Amino acid sequence: FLPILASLAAKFGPKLFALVTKKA
């Protein structure tokens, strides 16, 4: 889903992957 942008949100946001994608 998406090009790299979704994974960039994940990587540059450890805040974002923990919050948005709930991986924390």
CA dist list (Å): 15 to 7, 12, 20: 13, 8, 8
Residue with token string 């979704």: 6
What does the DSSP 8-state code read for residue 4? T
Residue with token string 């992957």: 17
What does the DSSP 8-state code read for residue 14? H
d(CA 11, CA 8) in angstroms, rounded, equals 5
Q: What angle do CA 10, 11, 15 make, to 5 degrees?
A: 65
Across 1-24, the runs of DSSP E, i.e. the strands, are: none
d(CA 1, CA 4) in angstroms, rounded, equals 9
Residues comprising the chain, all counted: 24
Structural biology method used: NMR
* 11's tokens: 């990587």
* Ramachandran area for residue 6 (φ above 0: left; ψ -120 to 50: alpha; else beta): alpha
Q: Which amino acid type is present at position 19?
A: L
d(CA 7, CA 24) in angstroms, rounded, equals 15
* 15's tokens: 């805040």
